[PDB]
Design a protein around this ligand. Structure first.
Ligand SMILES: [Mg+2]
Ligand SMILES: [Mg+2]
Lengths: 168, 159, 282
RNA sequence: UGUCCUAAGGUAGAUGAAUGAUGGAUGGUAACCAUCAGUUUAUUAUAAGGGAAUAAAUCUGCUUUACUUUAUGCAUAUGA
RNA sequence: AGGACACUGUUAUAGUUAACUAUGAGAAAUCUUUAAUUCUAUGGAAUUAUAUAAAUUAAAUUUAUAUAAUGAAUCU
RNA sequence: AGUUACGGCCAUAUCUACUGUAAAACACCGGAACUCGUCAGCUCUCCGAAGUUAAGCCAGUAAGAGCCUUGUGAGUACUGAGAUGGGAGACCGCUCGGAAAAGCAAGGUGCUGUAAUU
């Protein structure tokens, strides 16, 4: 097999959905993502005003951080142990990605620190083969070939081999 | 449809089908000199230098060349007479008027015939445009041509 | 609720050179405009492009049927002067345009009146002589690449000004310039010569002997020492001022290469292949 | 239609808009995050018409060309 | 004008696994299209040699101006 | 005889499926000591040459969609000039001239300018 046909991990994304008017719940949760990885947080705003969710327009809601490198492997190997390395069949998309969510970040292995509080988050991963610079460059922009795109069953193969786990 | 500068332009200032967008480089590379012949065609994608809508498609002559404008002289039909107009337009609204090219070639070739006949004692046999008169004679052959009988035919309804 | 056929018929296809993501058509037209009075005077432009392992520099003047080149220079021509280890460095952009502008004047015989300067790094723009012809005028095409402070494209126009060809530019995009201060001419002189490359090479030896053999392997395989690079680079510039002429190649004939060519299938084989496809079904 | 704008004026640079499909703890028709598709459906102060997809649209920076003086044309004329 | 249902506005019913396939009706403020007619311009000046500039170009290099000579070219 | 850098005309050059290329070139590709840029060397910027022809670029196949062109449609629809022609009217017929589209068949699927390398 040619080594350009391999599958890898492009990036991982973390999202903490808090909804509130207090900046103290934001700034407490902003320290948790810095405590997990040394990157800094990035905020998000609202699109409209929804009374049923306690949301007004142009107002801060949540935080998210995009990570890459080998640091993403240490966060991913922790999160799979919470579900005992067991996943469903429908978590895989048409394009190849998948995700999961954990109710408690204390199960990740941090300290309590009670004034910070207890939160929860959900993760999402990306898979790309080598040769993905073609659709991303400015000069010489073009499409990807039809032979190199990942499908749903290709995620079902690579997940079991790199992590010995159970499919449901 | 009141009296304004751009009245009643719905199909005259519309860009045609599958041809939208800013013009190309072959427009900008052309040059103009004093005494040429130029037709006017509005490109409705630039808004600096458009003439009035009356002059769309009339040919004139170029008398001045400015850093941003070209001067064209024309003729308008005011109530009794034929007057003289001057307008300044941009380069992206013009076109080189053809129609003298067959004439200017005839000038250059007749000037060569005059030169070769100077060395001889003959009279000039110039080139002028042809004339069409009565129908000339021709010769048909009945060896391979057979006549076809034509007649009427009875009427038949379409259903 | 439109069909699949109407969505294709209403499609307007962009231009061919825009389709391949190679040019910016609004940027080109503003470069080659001209006032209408100067009919006989065509503009010049210098093109600086790089491939993955080369630097290409051309001087052109545009026409209706297509462009034409006046003089070109290739970064792979520097083997004749002794620089063949770095073909994409900060020095490689400088010497290529320096050979380009030196080659253009020798077509016009202005080599005696306008000669090269010494590579000091001071911000200067050449001027006119009192009685003779004025200097030549060339503008710069940046292409599609973004503009930064220490870019490699901006140092190639520095090489054209040192050959004597007049190019309007300002010192704001150079290395060692800060606002409201005199220009640090010696700091620019350390990036023109490959001093930062040599001190990275000296640092890697005592720090990581394993990583250094991977990164600078052609510097290892050729017998090239880091403490002497600018002695070789300075010797390379002196040969260009002596002789800028090209060297001719003999013309061979390549007609045996025609065998890697596929024609289109004819009409007789097209109608034959259809009935064999219909034969297997019945 | 008798209005609005120190930016909604000037210029440089960066940029797949509206929407749809499939997924992700609490999360539902509808909160946020990733992936793929996306020929102009979106926006451009306003009536209608015309124009614009490396964009005249959305962001980031810097500024006051919302100047002073010689001559001429176009609506448009016999004529302010 | 004629034409078309492909864009914008409109309308009757049957089928196949919201999408495709049929037979019907249409447009003063709709257009992938498009005649008969109406109108604008050319059908004689161009080339050569020499000179002038304070314009213009990298440049006798262009853009312009003079003087000399060489001419009747579509039907009524 | 093909590539590669600038292009002119801007679909015969687009879109959806499969298949192939010796040399050289073009790419993918390895990293952040310095200039520069981000939440993230993803993009941009700056140094490189272990690996790979899987993709991109180039060239092919399809009773393929789309575009381009010839014939039929058809002297059919329509129309410039005219008469003490016909009809309650709506309108129709004749003489001397000009002359269509949509479909339905058959065929095609970029051409080219300056320079460089095998
Ligand atoms: Mg204005
Ligand atoms: Mg505006």
């Amino acid at each position: 097999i040619n080594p350009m046909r391999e599958i890898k991990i492009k990036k991982l994304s973390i999202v903490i959905n808090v909804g509130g008017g207090s900046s103290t719940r934001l700034n407490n949760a902003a320290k948790v993502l810095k405590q997990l990885t040394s990157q800094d947080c990035l905020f998000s705003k609202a699109r409209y005003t929804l009374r049923n969710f306690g949301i007004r327009r142009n107002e801060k809601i949540s935080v998210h951080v995009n990570v890459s490198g080998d640091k993403a492997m240490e966060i991913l190997k922790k999160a799979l142990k919470v579900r005992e390395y067991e996943l469903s069949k429908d978590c895989f998309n048409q394009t190849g990605c998948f995700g999961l969510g954990i109710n408690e970040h204390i199960d990740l292995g941090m300290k309590y620190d009670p004034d910070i509080g207890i939160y929860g988050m959900n993760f999402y991963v990306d898979l790309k083969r080598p040769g993905d610079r073609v659709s991303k460059r400015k000069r010489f922009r073009s499409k990807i070939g039809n032979k190199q795109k990942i499908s749903k069953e290709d995620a079902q193969k690579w997940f079991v081999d790199t992590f010995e786990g159970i499919l449901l | 449809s009141a009296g304004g500068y751009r009245r009643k332009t719905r199909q005259l200032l519309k860009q045609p089908f599958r041809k939208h967008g800013t013009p190309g480089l072959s427009v900008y590379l052309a040059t103009y000199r004093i005494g040429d012949y130029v037709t006017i065609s509005i490109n409705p994608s630039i808004h600096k230098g458009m003439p009035f809508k009356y002059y769309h498609g009339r040919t004139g002559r170029v008398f001045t060349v400015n850093p941003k404008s070209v001067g064209v002289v024309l003729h308008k039909k005011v109530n009794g007479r034929l007057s003289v107009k001057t307008i300044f337009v941009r380069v992206e609204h013009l076109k080189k008027y053809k129609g003298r090219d067959a004439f200017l070639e005839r000038v250059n070739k007749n000037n060569e015939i005059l030169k070769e006949a100077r060395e001889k004692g003959i009279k000039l046999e110039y080139i002028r445009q042809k004339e069409e008169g009565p129908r000339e004679e021709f010769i048909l052959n009945l060896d391979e041509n057979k006549p076809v009988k034509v007649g009427y035919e009875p009427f038949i309804k379409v259903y | 609720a439109k069909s699949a056929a109407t969505k294709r018929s209403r499609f307007q296809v962009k231009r061919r050179r825009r389709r391949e993501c190679k040019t910016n058509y609004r940027h080109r037209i503003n470069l080659i405009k001209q006032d209408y009075n100067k009919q006989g005077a065509l503009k010049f432009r210098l093109v600086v492009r790089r491939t993955n392992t080369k630097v290409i520099c051309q001087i052109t003047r545009s026409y209706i049927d297509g462009d034409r080149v006046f003089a070109f220079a290739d970064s792979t021509e520097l083997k004749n002067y002794g620089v063949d280890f770095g073909l994409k460095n900060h020095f490689a952009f400088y010497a290529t345009g320096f050979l380009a502008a030196r080659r253009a004047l020798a077509k016009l015989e202005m080599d005696d009146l306008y000669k090269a300067k010494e590579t000091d790094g001071t911000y200067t723009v050449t001027e006119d002589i009192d009685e003779e012809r004025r200097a030549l005028k060339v503008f710069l095409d940046i292409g599609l690449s973004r503009s930064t402070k220490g870019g490699n494209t901006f140092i190639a126009m520095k090489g054209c000004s040192d050959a004597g060809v007049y190019i309007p530019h300002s010192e704001s995009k150079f290395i060692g310039y800060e606002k409201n201060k005199p220009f640090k001419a010696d700091e620019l002189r350390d990036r023109i010569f490959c001093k930062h490359v040599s001190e990275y090479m000296k640092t890697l030896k005592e720090n990581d002997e394993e990583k250094f053999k991977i990164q600078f392997s052609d510097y290892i395989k050729k017998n090239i020492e880091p403490d002497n690079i600018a002695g070789i680079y300075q010797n390379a510039l002196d040969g260009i001022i002596k002789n800028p002429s090209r060297q001719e190649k003999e013309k061979k004939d390549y007609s045996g290469f025609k065998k890697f060519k596929v024609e289109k299938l004819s009409l007789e084989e097209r109608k034959k292949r259809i009935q064999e496809k219909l034969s297997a079904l019945k």
